[PDB]
DNA sequence: AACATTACAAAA
């Protein structure tokens, strides 16, 4: 029966086989962390281990030395719950194979040449991997007495809508015909799984819950693989990439990794894949109407409550700003009615929006769109005023409402982490235990069961989270469309979908959450944000969590690459040949094709099939791909050749093959050399007959083969090695490693031509709004980066909302670095994928399209870790000299200083608008403080900021820059650095700081209060807007109340209702009167008018009555006289003047105190 | 007037 693991008691945990290079890399870079971070601290540890080199091998011994720390903790430690372990990557096969090479490693392992496992070890350790398919695949290989069994055990042999539908499955299985049979088999397997599932869990649930034992345990775990991780007979799981993000089933319920993520450890094959699978994944979320939302959620938080029992406590809290904020929104927006359009344009069109929830929005619509409540008809219309009213947008209101319905998920999030505390308080079992009963009491308790799902989905997406860091790739994206309801003509809805984190950040969140991830890959480190993470914002997120490998340590993978790939002392050549467009090669070979036609645009239009428009674009990838082909056949020793195309050669265009197949022949026959043709090599084509035969051809033939295939077509593990026989092979294979004949003699493709890859944007082909969301990720993820501009991000979203075409959306991609650094990715790739072997022929032909050439001259990177054809590649692309091009850094500076000032402003303007709504908030005003403490404590920072990083800009002096825009006009127009060497200068000197802190009375306030009196020269330095609308305001306030709190002056709190308005209130004497402040740093023009000065004094009177005013600035000229003002604002006597201005505190000159001016305020006090 | 495609996974 079962193995145990009191098999184990005499096994030693110290004898380990000879650990190769990759080996020690891995641990003693796993090692640092656990001294430097915890043992409880997650890692992300990406590996550039490229195939061939034995990768696969290393990361499955990592896995079974795993697996054996665990056996040992377990037998020291005689209860702990079992570590897991997971092994992800994106294709099935890929899984079945790592998991049958894990199972191969346990049963061969040998150590000093005796076996390392007894049978009864072996058997054991191949007790705890399990693989997790899909539903379908998961019932379909289980057999029908597992299934009966399993019918039985749970009394599901009678429902007749149960026994109907496994009884037609059976029946199917019987009769598995061609697969005209098996699709639907697949689909009905599926949906049965579901059902059927769904009643054991129901069923398990309640009291009547079967016990499971023997043969019913042993069926339910075949059927549920699932159950043996629940249990704990297994803890390593073999799955892909969607199968971890949804989950997988149990007894009880659907387990979800990433919510149980403290302690595991993961293994991603192909990380950088990883990014485009998870996207694809996100971009699937079920729209929501935000009016159906808003308006549930305020009609059903107005009353209902939650009980008062202890397993509620201070739940409830929890919701209250929440309750508040329903209700005054609904207020403001008059929920009570429902929401139409009237107008012109507004009928044939949706009304489109799109907010990254920062600062890029765009609408659809030519004009703003205004919505405003009609009383009298009892609606809430949609308006387009044809003539700015802040209040009444429909773009404030959907935002408002998205922000409320994120605010209430968070919310249900927090109270379910609350109920699992106090649920574990009480009955004295994990967070993923009480997840699904705590959410349905809230939701039952507040009578929102509608939520249900959705909420799920967010625990799916968000359960897995250093706050006030700005960053697309926490926040998301929103894409909202109005348009009329379903079944009725006079309603609309607002279907939301939403975006509400990257890859990137789900990455970061799974390595905060205390999972260790091992992410193996050749090109794990590219510099792309569409094709890999973006490694600035992990490691901007991580720190030190982000671990890599040291100079030595690179050192000592590349020696072991070049021992077990020594080419240069075995006599192997890799010759690179670029090749050109030739119109003369291609129209003789076309008119020796069809020699009766007229002429070769006739052969082109008739014979080829090609349309006039394209035929220029098909004389250049076929006439290059044919040279490619001739120098293969003039080439005596060479046998194998792959073409990597980006378009398929199957029967779509049988024609241009044939004209293909033709010149082959002819070819051959020039040469005297059997060539035989293999077309269309596509993944299809492979689950037919399946690269076997290309491989049998090689062995048994002396002729050579020419392979026409796509970059999508040789995926990761697609392995074109073939099985040498050295009857039809000269002498010209080389062996490059010291391996003493291992196994099989393989060689791998000796000749390739590469083409430059085309579709470089990604796409998703789910649903019309998953593709919207993809290309508004990709757009907001280049301008995170800083590869775009602000203002050319923004007419890209623009044209995305509009419904451009993809060409024009690979024409705005093109334009970036961005684009260079996904073909050498994918170039990389490829001539990798080809080299999966150790035998090697005399010469190794390259040829490569020419317009490759200019993009690889521009590889920069260290190439202690490339192939050695990529290498090659690269040496014969510079080869050409150097080439003026843009540095990335500088270009990258220039567009994140635009992006960082746009933020700044749209931000600061939204702040202060929030400001001036009576009554205001709270966490507006701490905001609103510490955005100017921060700026007054910290003018410039040397390391890159974490809470307020948007606040800042790295520019390339150190303390100052210089600017030109207008800070009231367009965000999109200014201009940084060296493209404005004449330009507005933001430094320590225009601020007037030096002079400032010279005098006696503001200097002793700076130092108490912390404020910085210099600026370090550093890199980082404070945007134009809050230099401009922050930093002087703070300045001249700081300094006008050291100064009169130096003269025995009293300051309080100014409250909500006039915040703003004025920075502090005097109170002097105990003058019982009200006085009011208002500071400017220094002499500027009143652009605010007198009038609008005389609407604040009113405003403010309106509610303290009578009161003085003081308009004071810091800084100044001392001799200019003092003014006594009435209320418009107009020179009057000092007996009835309500107005005082005081010019300056302290002078320009001498930073001396305007004692006379101080005194005379002072009188002016004594003579109210 | 730009650019020029295939491939996959979990299903409900």
Do not use: K, L, M
């Given at each position: 029966m079962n193995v145990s693991i009191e098999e184990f008691t005499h096994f030693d945990f110290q004898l380990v086989p000879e650990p190769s290079p990759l080996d020690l890399v891995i641990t003693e870079s796993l090692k640092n962390h656990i001294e430097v971070n915890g043992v409880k601290s997650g890692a992300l540890l990406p590996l550039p281990f490229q195939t061939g080199i034995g990768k696969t091998y290393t990361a499955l011994n990592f896995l079974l030395q795993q697996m054996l720390e665990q056996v040992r903790s377990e037998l020291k430690e005689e209860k702990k719950s079992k570590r897991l372990l997971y092994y992800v990557t994106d294709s099935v096969d890929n899984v079945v194979s790592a998991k049958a090479d894990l199972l191969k490693l346990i049963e061969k392992q040998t150590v000093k040449g005796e076996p390392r496992f007894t049978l009864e070890q072996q058997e054991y350790l191949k007790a705890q991997i399990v693989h997790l398919p899909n539903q379908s695949e998961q019932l379909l290989q289980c057999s029908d007495a597992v299934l009966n069994d399993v019918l039985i055990g749970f009394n599901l042999n009678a429902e007749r809508d149960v026994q109907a539908e496994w009884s037609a499955i059976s029946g199917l299985r019987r009769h598995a015909s061609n697969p005209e049979v098996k699709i639907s088999l697949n689909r009905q397997a599926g949906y049965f799984y579901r059902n059927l599932i769904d009643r054991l869990q129901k069923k398990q649930k309640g009291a009547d819950r079967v016990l499971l034992s023997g043969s019913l345990l042993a069926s339910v775990e075949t059927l549920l693989p699932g159950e043996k991780i629940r249990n704990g007979s297994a803890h390593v799981a073999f799955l892909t990439t969607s199968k971890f993000l949804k989950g997988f089933h149990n007894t009880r319920s659907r387990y979800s990794p990433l919510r149980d993520l403290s302690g595991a450890v993961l293994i991603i094959d192909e990380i950088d894949k990883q990014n485009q699978v998870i996207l694809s994944e996100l971009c699937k979320q079920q729209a929501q109407d935000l009016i159906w939302a808003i308006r549930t959620l305020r009609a059903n938080f107005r009353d209902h409550q939650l009980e008062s029992s202890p397993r509620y406590d201070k739940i409830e809290d929890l919701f209250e700003p929440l309750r508040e904020r329903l209700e005054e929104f609904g207020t403001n927006w008059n929920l009570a009615f429902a929401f139409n359009t009237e107008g012109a344009n507004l009928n044939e069109r949706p009304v489109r929006l799109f907010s990254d929830r920062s600062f890029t929005h765009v609408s659809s619509a030519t004009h703003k769109l205004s919505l405003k409540s009609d009383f009298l008809r009892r609606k809430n219309l949609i308006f387009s005023d044809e003539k700015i009213e802040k209040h009444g947008l429909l773009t404030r209101f959907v935002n408002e409402a998205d922000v409320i319905y994120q605010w209430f998920l968070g919310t249900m999030r927090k109270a379910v982490f609350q109920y699992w505390e106090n649920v574990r308080g009480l009955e004295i079992r994990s967070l993923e235990g009480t997840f699904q009963e705590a959410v349905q009491s809230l939701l039952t308790h507040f009578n929102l069961q509608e939520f249900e799902s959705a909420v799920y989905e967010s625990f799916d997406t968000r359960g897995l989270r250093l706050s006030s860091s700005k960053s697309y790739h926490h926040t998301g994206l929103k894409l909202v469309e109005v348009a009329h309801n379903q079944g009725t003509r006079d309603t609309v809805n607002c279907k939301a979908s939403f975006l509400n984190t990257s890859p990137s950040g789900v990455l970061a969140d799974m390595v905060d959450a205390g999972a260790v991830i091992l992410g193996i890959s050749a090109?794990?480190?590219?510099?792309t944000v569409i094709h890999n993470f973006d490694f600035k914002y992990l490691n901007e997120r991580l720190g030190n969590k982000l671990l890599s490998l040291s100079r030595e340590q690179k050192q000592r993978v590349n020696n072991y690459y070049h021992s077990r790939r020594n080419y240069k002392d075995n006599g192997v050549v890799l010759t690179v040949k670029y090749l050109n467009s030739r119109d003369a090669f291609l129209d003789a070979l076309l008119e020796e094709y069809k020699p009766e036609a007229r002429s070769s645009h006739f052969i082109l239009n008739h014979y080829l099939g090609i349309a006039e428009s394209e035929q220029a674009f098909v004389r250049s990838w076929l006439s290059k791909l044919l040279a490619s082909i001739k120098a293969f056949i003039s080439?005596?020793?060479?046998?194998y050749m792959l073409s990597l195309l980006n378009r398929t050669l199957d029967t779509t265009r049988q024609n241009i093959n044939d004209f293909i197949q033709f010149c082959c022949d002819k070819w051959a026959k020039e040469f005297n050399v059997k060539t035989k043709t293999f077309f269309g090599v596509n993944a299809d084509w492979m689950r037919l007959v399946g690269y076997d035969e290309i491989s049998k051809h090689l062995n048994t033939e002396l002729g050579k083969v020419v392979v026409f295939s796509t970059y999508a077509s040789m995926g990761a593990g697609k392995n074109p090695d073939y099985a040498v026989n050295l009857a039809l092979e000269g002498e010209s294979l080389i062996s490059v490693a010291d391996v003493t004949y291992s196994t099989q003699l393989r060689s791998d493709i000796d000749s390739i031509y590469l083409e430059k890859p085309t579709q470089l944007l990604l796409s998703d082909d789910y649903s019309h709004t998953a593709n919207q969301l993809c290309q508004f990720h990709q757009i907001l993820s280049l301008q995170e980066n800083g590869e775009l501009s602000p203002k050319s991000a923004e007419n890209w979203c623009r044209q995305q909302l509009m419904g451009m075409s993809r060409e024009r959306s690979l024409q705005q991609y093109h334009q970036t670095s961005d684009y260079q650094s996904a073909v050498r990715k994918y170039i990389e790739q490829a001539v990798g994928r080809?080299?999966?072997?150790?035998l090697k022929r005399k010469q190794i032909l390259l040829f490569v399209d020419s317009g490759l050439k200019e993009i690889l001259a521009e590889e920069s990177r260290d190439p202690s870790l490339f192939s050695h054809e990529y290498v090659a590649l690269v040496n014969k692309a510079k080869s050409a000299g150097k080439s003026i091009v843009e540095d990335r850094a500088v270009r990258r500076l220039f567009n994140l200083a635009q992006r960082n000032n746009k933020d700044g402003m749209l931000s600061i303007k939204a702040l202060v608008h929030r400001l001036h709504n009576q009554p205001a908030s709270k966490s507006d005003i701490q905001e609103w403080q510490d955005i100017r403490t921060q700026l007054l404590r910290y003018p410039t920072v040397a390391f890159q900021p974490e809470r307020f990083n948007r606040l800042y800009l790295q520019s390339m002096t150190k303390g100052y820059y210089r600017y030109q825009g207008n800070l009231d006009g367009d965000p999109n127009s200014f201009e940084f650095f060296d493209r404005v060497p004449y330009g507005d200068m933001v430094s320590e000197e225009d601020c007037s700081l030096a002079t400032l802190v010279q005098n006696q009375y503001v200097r002793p306030w700076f130092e108490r209060k912390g404020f910085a009196c210099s600026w370090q020269k550093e890199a980082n330095v404070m945007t134009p807007i809050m230099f401009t609308n922050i930093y002087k305001g703070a300045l001249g306030e700081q300094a006008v109340e050291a100064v009169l709190t130096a003269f025995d002056f009293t300051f309080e709190e100014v409250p909500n209702s006039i915040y703003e308005r004025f920075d502090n209130r005097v109170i002097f004497a105990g003058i019982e009167q009200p006085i009011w402040l208002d500071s400017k740093y220094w002499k500027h023009e009143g652009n605010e008018s007198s009038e609008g000065y005389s609407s604040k004094i009113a405003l403010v009177e309106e509610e303290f009555g009578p009161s003085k005013f003081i308009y004071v600035n810091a800084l100044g000229d001392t001799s200019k006289p003092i003014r006594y003002l009435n209320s418009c604002f107009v020179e009057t006597s000092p007996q009835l003047a309500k107005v005082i201005e005081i010019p300056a505190l302290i002078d320009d000159s001498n930073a001396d105190t305007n004692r006379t001016a101080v005194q005379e305020l002072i009188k002016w006090l004594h003579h109210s």
């Open positions: 090109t794990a480190r590219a510099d080439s005596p020793d060479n046998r080809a080299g999966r072997t150790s």
